[PDB]
Design a protein around this ligand. Structure first.
Ligand SMILES: NC(=O)c1cccc(NC(=O)CCC(=O)N2CCN(c3ccc(F)cc3)CC2)c1
Length: 180
């Protein structure tokens, strides 16, 4: 099997890519001081994500299957997330707004008070409303319960949080390190 090797490239604050990630982060987290933004380059996890992205784009027609959402995680979970993504209830949570993921429950501050939030490329595809109780995605058609939804959101009209259940559904593209 593919070992899923990766590289972590630190973006300069003068780099246009840093300003774009900073721009989305500061839409809800302007009160947080960004210590650094690093781009995770995992070719195997990327190709695998882009494989599922190809299949989804051909399934969901006109739908924009991809959203860029936030994920707050502990310091210690960063090398695991760099190499594996959010693969392995079965679900991984993703916030539309960065201040949701900036909660110390999710982005637990380390010994130096640094908090970590990934600016993830997720394959939200075709989604419906989900409660806190479900562990598997619901069936689109009950007469064909094999065809399941790609994600589940809190509000279908105004999404704030998403639940990804599938392998290679998310790519941890950016790591935002920040403090209070
Ligand atoms: N780790 C994160 O950054 C992050 C990003 C978005 C959401 C979350 N985590 C949570 O919301 C966890 C808390 C929690 O357990 N809830 C709040 C909302 N929940 C929910 C579950 C499924 C839905 F369709 C809609 C909402 C499940 C019960 C974490």
């Amino acid at each position: 099997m593919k070992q899923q090797n990766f590289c972590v490239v630190e973006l300069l604050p003068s780099d246009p890519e840093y300003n774009t990630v900073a721009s989305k982060f500061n839409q809800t987290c302007s009160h947080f001081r960004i210590e650094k933004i690093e781009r995770i380059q995992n070719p195997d996890l990327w190709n695998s994500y882009q494989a599922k992205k190809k299949t989804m784009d051909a399934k969901n027609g006109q739908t924009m299957n991809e959203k860029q959402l936030f994920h707050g995680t502990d310091a210690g979970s960063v090398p695991h997330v760099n190499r594996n993504g959010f693969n392995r209830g079965k679900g991984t949570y993703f916030a539309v707004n960065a201040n949701y993921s900036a909660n110390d429950t999710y982005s637990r501050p380390d010994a130096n008070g640094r908090k970590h939030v990934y600016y993830v490329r997720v394959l939200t595809g075709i989604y419906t409303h989900g409660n806190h109780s479900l562990i598997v995605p619901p069936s689109k058609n009950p007469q064909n319960p094999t065809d399941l939804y790609d994600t589940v959101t809190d509000n279908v009209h105004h999404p704030s949080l998403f639940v990804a259940f599938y392998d290679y559904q998310a790519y941890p593209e950016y790591l935002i390190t920040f403090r209070k």
